[PDB]
Amino acid sequence: IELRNLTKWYPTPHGRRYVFRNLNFRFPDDVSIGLIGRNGAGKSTLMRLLGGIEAPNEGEVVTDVSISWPVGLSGGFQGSLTARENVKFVCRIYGTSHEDMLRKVRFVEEFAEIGEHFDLPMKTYSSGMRSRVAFGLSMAFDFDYYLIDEAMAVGDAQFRAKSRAVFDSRVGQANMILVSHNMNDIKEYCDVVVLVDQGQATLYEDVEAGIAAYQG
Amino acid sequence: IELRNLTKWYPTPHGRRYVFRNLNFRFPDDVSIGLIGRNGAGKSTLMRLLGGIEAPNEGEVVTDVSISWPVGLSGGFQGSLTARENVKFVCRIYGTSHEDMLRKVRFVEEFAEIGEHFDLPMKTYSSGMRSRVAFGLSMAFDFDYYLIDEAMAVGDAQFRAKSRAVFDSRVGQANMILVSHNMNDIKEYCDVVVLVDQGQATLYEDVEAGIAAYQG
Amino acid sequence: SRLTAKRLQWALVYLPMLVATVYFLVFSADRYVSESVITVRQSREDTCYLQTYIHSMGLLQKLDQQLKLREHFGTPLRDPLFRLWGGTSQEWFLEYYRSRVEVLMDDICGLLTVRVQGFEPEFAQALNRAILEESERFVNELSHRMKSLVVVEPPVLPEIAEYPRRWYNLATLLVVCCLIYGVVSLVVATIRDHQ
Amino acid sequence: SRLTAKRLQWALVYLPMLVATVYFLVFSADRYVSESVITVRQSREDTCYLQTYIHSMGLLQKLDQQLKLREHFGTPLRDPLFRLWGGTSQEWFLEYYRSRVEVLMDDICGLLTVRVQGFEPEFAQALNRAILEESERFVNELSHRMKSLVVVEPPVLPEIAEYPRRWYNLATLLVVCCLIYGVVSLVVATIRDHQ
Amino acid sequence: RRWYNLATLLVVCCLIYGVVSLVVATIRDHQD
Amino acid sequence: RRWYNLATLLVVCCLIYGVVSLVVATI
Amino acid sequence: KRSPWQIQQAVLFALFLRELKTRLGGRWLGVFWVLLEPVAHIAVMTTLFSLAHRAAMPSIEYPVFLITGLIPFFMFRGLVTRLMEAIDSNRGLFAYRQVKPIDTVIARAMLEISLQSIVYLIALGTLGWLGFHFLPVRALELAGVSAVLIMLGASLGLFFAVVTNEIPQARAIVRISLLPLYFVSGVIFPVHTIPPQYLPLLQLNPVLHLIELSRASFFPQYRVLQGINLAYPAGFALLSLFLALMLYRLRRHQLAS
Amino acid sequence: KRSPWQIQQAVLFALFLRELKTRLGGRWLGVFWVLLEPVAHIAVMTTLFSLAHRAAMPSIEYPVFLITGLIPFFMFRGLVTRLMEAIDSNRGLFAYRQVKPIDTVIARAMLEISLQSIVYLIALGTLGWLGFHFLPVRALELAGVSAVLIMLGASLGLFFAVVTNEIPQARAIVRISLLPLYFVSGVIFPVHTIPPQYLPLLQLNPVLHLIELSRASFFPQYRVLQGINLAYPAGFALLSLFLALMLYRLRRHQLAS
Ligand SMILES: Nc1ncnc2c1ncn2[C@@H]1O[C@H](COP(=O)(O)OP(=O)(O)O)[C@@H](O)[C@H]1O
Ligand SMILES: Nc1ncnc2c1ncn2[C@@H]1O[C@H](COP(=O)(O)OP(=O)(O)O)[C@@H](O)[C@H]1O
Ligand code: ALF
Ligand code: ALF
Which chains touch A (3 or more CB pairs under 8 A)? Predict the structure, then answer.
């Protein structure tokens, strides 16, 4: 990826809040990236931009590699439905056959330790079950860049345990870009760190240096 | 509080999921409580029950002390509005005068390091700003029992810093019941722990014992 | 602030009530009505002619010359809202006479109903009789110049004052005053809170 | 999966197309129509009488006795769907004659329009003339025992076969077959995916 | 009416051009 | 009627200017 | 500890202004809409049926004949069609231990009662200004009929809101249920032209009785059709209110989430 | 890398069945609703205007006179009133880098085109079964008129959906905009009884022209009123489609959140 020049603003009533201005940053390669940022920064906005959810209006991004959809903690799923039809829709949306779709759905149910609640509408899930389903779906598909937005903050220890097990079963061919507020996790889940402040974005190799820049 | 016998279920299509059955547990006194639970348990449901959001249908709870409303990470606020009218509504809902209402709103703006975004509709907040506003509102009102549902998981270090500063300015007269998935925080934010599993609820004095029971 | 103290009810509920009662029971004068029901047959055209002519200025001139309405309608000195002040304009006198003699038309049967209000019970019946006789004469002369009047119910002599309605008006204006009080109080609370 | 595997296209689109083309362009026989426009004047009542009588069984009996319709309508051996099979029930013959002679009534002007279909150009005009003459005779007899026929446009001798429409029916038929093909394919995809 | 027919045909043809062009532009830009 | 036709032409001109400007702004 | 009536008053007031800023709107287009739509309808019917009304009965004029039946009808229509979202659109606020669904359904009713009373007052004032009759002959009867109409409409709105919580499709139903009610009630045209043989099916509509009673108690010469009474709408309002309160109390705890 | 047309087909198919289970409903009440509501309306109009229609013109019967104008009208009505939520109710799904608003507005149109074609076919079959005319005399003209009606309706729905994203109140507008269209289009009653002096205002409704052309091309003796043509609706459909696509492409990036 290249992440060429861009400008990102939103139609605020008080004129226009130019969140991103003239950002020309080249992301590192073959290393997990940790976005730290702060409140009021554009980590989620940048996260969606990486996922192609909304196109830049005064810029563009070059991505010559497959990008998985963002996970997040809200959005990306359809309510009033059970997870079963949602996962059938998500494997149908990428033009798949029946055998791979069925086996990937089966993997989705196997990863998530969910009983009858898997056959329940999207309204009747807790804050953790939806995140677990989304996280299991994220590593279901084959990609290179896995986009994580603090999707474990609502999970138990076993969730982190088998998520780490799955990722270590899938290391060597894909890398992860994640943003979280628990830096004990990002210390051991990332290689290099990127800090964004006042719209500006900066990269930090050493994780401790990025932590100090966060708290600086 | 007493928390007498109760039965809690939901109208699931597959009969009825009896989440809570014959729970007769007496909470401790003058100590911060930490709910650990697990995915599929009823921490949030029990959290709402403590807040009186929904009354028990086959039981009741005796609470001879003022209970603050739950904070949570979703719900409890009104969308399509700025935080200003929301805080005027929340100080008007408890039958307050004008001077105390204005000073409490001013405290709300002072606690949250939010600039012009405080005068923006509820749609255009990040995952952290709404939690910051709700958390500042929680310690705005005077109560005894502060109900916290992992409301810091989307905050920065300064958020935890001044939240701890405010709480330590308000210790000695109120206690906190909190649920979170980062037990480094609950180790130093709580006195005794309560674990709920298979609808059943259990109390643990030593925090390390509760942690081991969680991971056991 | 100023429009927030308790005086607001006295601004809308109390003082209008007091002035209404003092007028209605102390100052008011009785207005006996006399009702007659007539028609024209030999249909709708001549009845409409009569309905227009009854309110006409020429009939008022004839009645003023014949019964001296202007002198009589100014006899109640106590009532300040319903007396014909001396020296008033002729147009105001025509408006007053139009306001007193009430003419109603029935759609199905085509029957004119004349309700004449006088300050003396004999005067109202006399005015009704004069109106009926002059209307009949006009219908005869008009048709003859270019028909008869059928009196279904003749003018009656009243016994008590059908007008004004003291307790009825007091109750309905009280209801209106509390409705306005509630609306104004809600508006005032809205301004005093959103400020 | 047997409904799938590309044979469904031949199932609804191709084979119906071939059968229609083979019978429509090779088996079919020409049906020349003859059109006349008449009315009754001396209004709506007698025109309705005539409209009912034209389709009546007695007129069909008279026409069968006079022109030998049953022998002629069975002469095209090539056309399988539009020939009158020998020995058929009399009710079917009445239905056939009702299907051939088409009578239309105009609301504004009250003009009957008779379109008679024959397998020979002279036969259609002869049948139209016989129908018009017998209808006039029936109207006159009804007027006398219990009126005249005004022929606005007399029967005409056709030159080419207005019926059947080969390319028109073929094109619209294919239009319908592809619509049904799309609907059935969508339904089949729905079942094969939701299973 | 040669000129009126020519102008009407030009307007309709330009509108058809626009409809086809935007449909093609959408179907080509959606690939992302 | 001078001003009547002038106002009608003003309305028509404003509408066509808006349409043409929007069309050019597309491409 | 303050009395529950005081906290009810505080809750109702807070919900009142809260609902005001959104019902009226921050664009201030709500007031222009609700005092431009009624006059637009008034101009429409008159332009299409002035001659028809003058043929039917010439005793009273159309601009004053229709307003007195329209504004109460619009009031009832609004307080039966806006109470649907009094709970569903206010669901996210049910997290403060004091707010109850009955508060949110009656606060909107109070708001729109005030709004329609204001529009009625200003419409009567402007109609008197234009040179038309604007004084009710028997105002007490009009007030009583309006009160019973409010009772019936608020009861029906509460019952519908209680029933509709499971299936939010019911909006559409009331919307189609709102089409004949604007026509079969006789607000646009007098009921004189209605054929007698159809009359029973017209007499089963309570709002028709209420509109007819309002028109009779407003004008000095309006005559009611035989069979129109006040016992039927009063009994309907009472029974409907009983069953609505009965339902709401049956499913009070389920009114959440 | 597969062609964008293949991924369009996959996206459209996935959105198709997805939309099917919710438009039809899991209760299977959708099919019963959409084949019980039309016959209920048919029974209503006939019961209230059979004598009036027989007085107006007796050439054709009411049960077949009204269906041919009703079902296309219901089709256009639905594809102009359900495309409102094709984006707003499907907003939460716009997070997979391939789903675009044009896909979600045209998938619903394809679904309801299929549904209304099925209801038309079954209604024609049952009307032929009951003993009524059920073969279009000139079916090609009916197909062309239906195609241009679909073009106009889908264009108007797309334009309205693009415009309405800022203010979701516009539903109400189209709802009131849906009331005269059911009446002024002449679907319920023939346009013969309409006074000529009012005729220009009737001629400005394209759906009236389309319904009249469908009725003329279906029955063998229907006569069109003077001034009714196909140039006006075709030009309206083309210009509206151009402006709708023009708007959608202007505000494509804002169609998110
Ligand atoms: N729908 C919207 N309309 C207007 N402004 C928005 C919208 N969504 C987000 N924003 C603005 O864009 C910024 C994005 O911040 P975000 O990246 O969500 O913060 P974080 O990285 O902490 O999640 C916010 O400050 C917010 O004010
Ligand atoms: N609206 C609802 N309808 C039906 N069931 C629900 C609803 N909300 C919650 N539940 C059920 O109640 C349980 C409550 O779990 P919860 O306390 O939210 O978990 P956690 O403590 O991890 O937040 C869930 O398992 C869910 O299945
Ligand atoms: F919903 Al959770 F921990 F599973 F708050
Ligand atoms: F403030 Al955030 F994710 F919205 F850290």
Answer: B, H
